[PDB]
Design a protein around this ligand. Sequence first.
Ligand SMILES: Cc1cc2nc3c(=O)[nH]c(=O)nc-3n(C[C@H](O)[C@H](O)[C@H](O)COP(=O)(O)OP(=O)(O)OC[C@H]3O[C@@H](n4cnc5c(N)ncnc54)[C@H](O)[C@@H]3O)c2cc1C
Ligand SMILES: NC(=O)c1ccc[n+]([C@@H]2O[C@H](COP(=O)([O-])OP(=O)(O)OC[C@H]3O[C@@H](n4cnc5c(N)ncnc54)[C@H](O)[C@@H]3O)[C@@H](O)[C@H]2O)c1
Ligand SMILES: COc1ccc(CO)cc1
Lengths: 1206, 168, 56
Amino acid sequence: APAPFADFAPPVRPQSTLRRAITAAYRRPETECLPPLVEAATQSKEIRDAAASTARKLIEALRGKGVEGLVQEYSLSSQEGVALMCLAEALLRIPDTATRDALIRDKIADGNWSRSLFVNAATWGLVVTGKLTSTVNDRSLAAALTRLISRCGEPVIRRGVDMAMRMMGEQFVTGETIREALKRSKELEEKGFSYSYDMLGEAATTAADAERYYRDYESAIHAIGKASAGRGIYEGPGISIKLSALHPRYSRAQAARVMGELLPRVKALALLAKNYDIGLNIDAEEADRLELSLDLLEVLCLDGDLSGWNGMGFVVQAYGKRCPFVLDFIIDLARRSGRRIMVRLVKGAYWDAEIKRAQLDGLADFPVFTRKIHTDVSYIACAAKLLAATDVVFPQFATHNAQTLAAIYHMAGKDFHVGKYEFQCLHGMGEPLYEEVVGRGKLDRPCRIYAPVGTHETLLAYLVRRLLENGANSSFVHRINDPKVSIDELIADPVEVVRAMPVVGAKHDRIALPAELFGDARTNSAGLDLSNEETLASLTEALRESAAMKWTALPQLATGPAAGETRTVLNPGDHRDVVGSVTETSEEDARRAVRLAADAAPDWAAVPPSERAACLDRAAELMQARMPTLLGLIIREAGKSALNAIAEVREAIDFLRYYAEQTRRTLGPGHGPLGPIVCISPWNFPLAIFTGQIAAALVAGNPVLAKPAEETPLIAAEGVRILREAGIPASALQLLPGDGRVGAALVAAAETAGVMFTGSTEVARLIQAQLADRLSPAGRPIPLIAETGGQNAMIVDSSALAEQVVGDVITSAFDSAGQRCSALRVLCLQEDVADRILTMLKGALHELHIGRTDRLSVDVGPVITSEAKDNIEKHIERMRGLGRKVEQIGLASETGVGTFVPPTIIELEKLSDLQREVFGPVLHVIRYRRDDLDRLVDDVNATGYGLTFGLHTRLDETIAHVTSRIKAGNLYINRNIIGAVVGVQPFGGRGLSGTGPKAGGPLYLGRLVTTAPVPPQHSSVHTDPVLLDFAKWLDGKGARAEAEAARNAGSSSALGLDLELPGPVGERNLYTLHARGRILLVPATESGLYHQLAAALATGNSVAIDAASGLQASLKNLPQTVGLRVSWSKDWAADGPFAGALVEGDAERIRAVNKAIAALPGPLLLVQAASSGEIARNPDAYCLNWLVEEVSASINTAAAGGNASL
Amino acid sequence: DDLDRLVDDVNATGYGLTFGLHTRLDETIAHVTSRIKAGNLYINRNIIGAVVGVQPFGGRGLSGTGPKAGGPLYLGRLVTTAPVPPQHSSVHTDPVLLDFAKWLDGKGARAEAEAARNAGSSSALGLDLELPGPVGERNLYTLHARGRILLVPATESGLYHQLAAALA
Amino acid sequence: REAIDFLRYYAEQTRRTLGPGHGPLGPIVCISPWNFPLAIFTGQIAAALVAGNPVL
Ligand SMILES: Cc1cc2nc3c(=O)[nH]c(=O)nc-3n(C[C@H](O)[C@H](O)[C@H](O)COP(=O)(O)OP(=O)(O)OC[C@H]3O[C@@H](n4cnc5c(N)ncnc54)[C@H](O)[C@@H]3O)c2cc1C
Ligand SMILES: NC(=O)c1ccc[n+]([C@@H]2O[C@H](COP(=O)([O-])OP(=O)(O)OC[C@H]3O[C@@H](n4cnc5c(N)ncnc54)[C@H](O)[C@@H]3O)[C@@H](O)[C@H]2O)c1
Ligand SMILES: COc1ccc(CO)cc1
């Protein structure tokens, strides 16, 4: 048996001093990065004066010289221009130019114009307006297209087709094929330009895609080398490649596959480039790939088979904090290898994405600068370093910024020869600038044009966004065309502007560090960067040390540890790996624990809320400090990967801090505790959900009996140890390890005042049935918060981006071996794109690494137990036996020592083929016709579940349709459907998925006290109109007090609350309160009924009223608006599902009704009960908090390949 | 406490042209503007002097037929085939229209089901625009349901199309 | 002012929307009141005219 974590993440090679200097700078504070850059970029006054003059002359030339003229000629609105260009693009998809012309003339121009015409309207919107949107208003565009065609007819359509042709075939790309691009390059090559060709391609998701990009590159190298015809690496053309195009798993976590599989591919291409003596440049991609790419560069430059060739090139991004240290490494590598490495200095293309990623991952700082002027100084500083090393490297200064250009032109001085350095620019953007540079009549410096090649609609869209800087106001390309921006502004020297600032290198004031995402409310949890070699080295040691510890879990009662039966805890991924020992709780001691909690309840309720919250905050600090050790335990006890364990510890920290802050915002002495709360937690989030339930109950003033899942007691014991260390008294937090019999004893105990349960719907139903026999001392039902299964779907239409879909599906379905309650279970693919997406999904499936999770390279770990494995596999085999197509990855023999299920894709005929939640790595796929979208949504709702739901579409009309009809608590647009963030996507659903309130949301604590507080921002100015009609009807009937109570309910309701929650950039996180549905009303008196009806109507609900109440004659002559919401039910089980219940009666009647409600099939109903007297005395007898439904929606607004606002 | 009945009394005249509300309270604004049935609403200002293309002018009931003068639907009433007005669209689809279309598909009425879905998309119900105007004022223009439409069909398919149009 | 604005607004709406398939009704009778004897007079007439209809 391999020692745990002995091979967790060994580096490709021992890290040299130069490599460690790079890693040290990864997230260095911006105020520390800039001063040495300012120093290195400093030039003499005479040079600065000369550069400003040259920059002014270039900009004057640039300003002294398509779609805009088309918009002018036909008086098009912006939307008409966008719509016209979408039409033109589609018409160009028709090959036969004659068949197209007759379509325009005889069909389109008249009045009759598988995929929306407007799938790429975001791209054209950027072309037309300079602004990027994530999604497109396809109804607006359709209206605009109809309007413009009916107004201007065939002429405007032909003009649009001509314009789209000129842009898509001549301005965005140098050619559609490498042969065409090479032919079109002769003109500027005669004028002194050179070329670097980019076969559009990146981010391979499958082996097949990586192989396709490989043969694209190989064929392009042959064509470029044939055309170069011996011109060599400086005067002749070269190629640019992206490493992510050549392997579907290009990441540090997969470094072994990268070195073993990607490296030989790059070597083979470079050998071909060597034979033709052309340049081969490695483009720079995301920040977490920088240092990995250096390992490939080093191996390539030291490989003797490539000797004799100086065409290897490498991009370095000056917006990156490591840039100068990367350059030091490359210059030294050039000296060691004797190869004159071609170094392309760029600013960088992924800025918006890097900001969002660092925020999502909770890392210390950004790996890029946050002020644009800092990147400019960085670039000039790095240019000075390169210009000092032209003997050993070939600098290539890629920029369209005339100030940057002029600074470097003058920095380089008067001595020039071809091969010393060059400038570079992008095709169809840089030529106007660089035609003022190239040639003896200008500045006589060469420029290499980066020349995109292809027709790839997706990659074409990616490029147009890169070419237009995602529509950024800070970009030179935008500012050069901005008449409000003077030339003096454009030639401002960034070095001296930065030097003059109060704090040199201060972070952008409007971008939050990841720790500061929530401002003054609370401190964001911190993650770990698994691409950082220093982090990986330190984590390896911490993880090894965690595995040497003798972890234990014992019954921890208020009186001390208790004795019991002890057994070992085994690693689910390798049962030979003993993780620790658990001593399990006797039923008698479980009962004793509840009595001890009851005895201690007044003492804990007496601790002021802010001090209870301080315990949670202290526990959060402890968990953060202990994160590496906690990771190791979670990895081995629960079978989780490192990344998932980090996210879990982060979530536990976030729960602690969020409930602490919510307590500080809300709780006072009048919000009395329930009493002892039984917290029953699952094995799949054995720290986060465990901690969240307990922290909420504790901070609300209740003592807790914590019953962890039998599979994962050790991390629970560690969580309790930390909470107790943080100041939670032992009498307030007791740990009761064991199986469901321990849970059952706790639930049944007479002093149990509330139960928080996360687990299966079936166990939740058993708990509900036991609780229904009891009442609180105040004669109310015992509160149950139950978060249960999901049958979570994602709907993908033909406008979605397949590569994005595939990544989000693989992650949502198979992360944590599908053992997330939020996991994607049913993928619904529009028929027109189903086959292409399914092919990619199957290819991506086979790139997953399944195994014991103490290796960074493992993507998917084991399932928790042999019983789990057996249950999942029985489902797969039943599906397979029914003739459904089943795709599975083959598992390695090493998995035989643990309990693994291979990630599996099952193609279903109908959603009804799936009858129950299968809690494992099993994705079901169905196809749908576009016109059946609404029925599909009905079918998704018909499962009875409602937890998570995903939608991938670019079309606003589809977003509005689907999100208005789906009934789920957590919606995700154009992103994965997992990993809900506390206070950002408050988490919890409806129906079979649970009772609410949402964990990590603002209604949670209020369920854990006897008088609910007003949550922060919890109000609505909306009044339900049927409530208002009902209140008028009451007044008409003479029920004056009830009418007043109804109006008051209408005002007090928070129905219609519509909030945006603070979160990361590039995402919009919305939180809304809706009606729950149909509420079961069980009144005893006429006035009781009227109060119940007002409560339900004020929160937007319809009702079913118990016909056995005999109160039918109390609702005579209802307004139709109210009557439409009222039904009468004799057989409650026949008239559901309900979404809640209101009950009136004395204690015996409440108990009898509560038991009858627990027997209703389907969802667990949140039941509220009150006596007739309580209804008369207490305006809040029924709490409106529990009569609305919380919905969280998270929209990825970077999904159109850019962040507009940022 | 009689505010809602007062709004009913105002609506009960059968007219619905201009209406003013003076209040500092958002809940009263939301309440009253959601219940009054008048074509031109004014909040914390006078109720006269509608500005062309800023307060498109005209009401409902006994106040007239529409479309609003000085608004984007006006010219379409004066031609035999109405054009698509500027900015005239909505991403909202009426859910009962959608339920009707599914029912039509269930009955095998595939042509009417497609017609119903197309009406659902073509409807501008839910349009919610801010019109350009002076500073210190917000001028909003919205498209709502009209109410109950009288359907006088002759054939089953005609009824399905009329119902789709009204539901959409 | 209102008469001026009707004229310019219906002119702009025409430029934004009307094409050959938006055929006129024919003669439109425009009946106007004494309380806005220029503005409502002009508004009704301008709209009818610019939509391509002759006006009484
Ligand atoms: C020939 C060529 C090849 C290129 N190859 C690559 C490559 O392999 N990898 C890659 O990542 N990029 C590459 N780029 C660069 C990228 O695609 C953009 O073209 C480049 O960053 C624009 O810089 P500029 O000097 O033209 O314009 P500018 O307007 O001067 O600079 C804009 C740049 O500033 C940076 N920036 C913007 N806002 C901020 C901010 N708030 N804080 C900090 N920085 C900010 C960004 O890097 C942005 O692109 C290449 C560019 C060219 C011309
Ligand atoms: N909605 C959510 O937020 C959420 C989150 C995580 C997991 N889940 C659900 O959790 C389920 C998987 O977790 P699980 O396997 O641990 O669920 P589960 O029902 O198997 O186990 C949960 C807990 O209930 C206990 N238990 C079992 N029988 C009991 C009984 N008769 N009385 C009292 N307690 C009893 C177990 O000991 C365990 O601690 C899935 O259905 C999943 O969807 C939901
Ligand atoms: C727009 O020019 C670019 C060239 C290369 C890259 C590498 O990702 C990005 C942009």
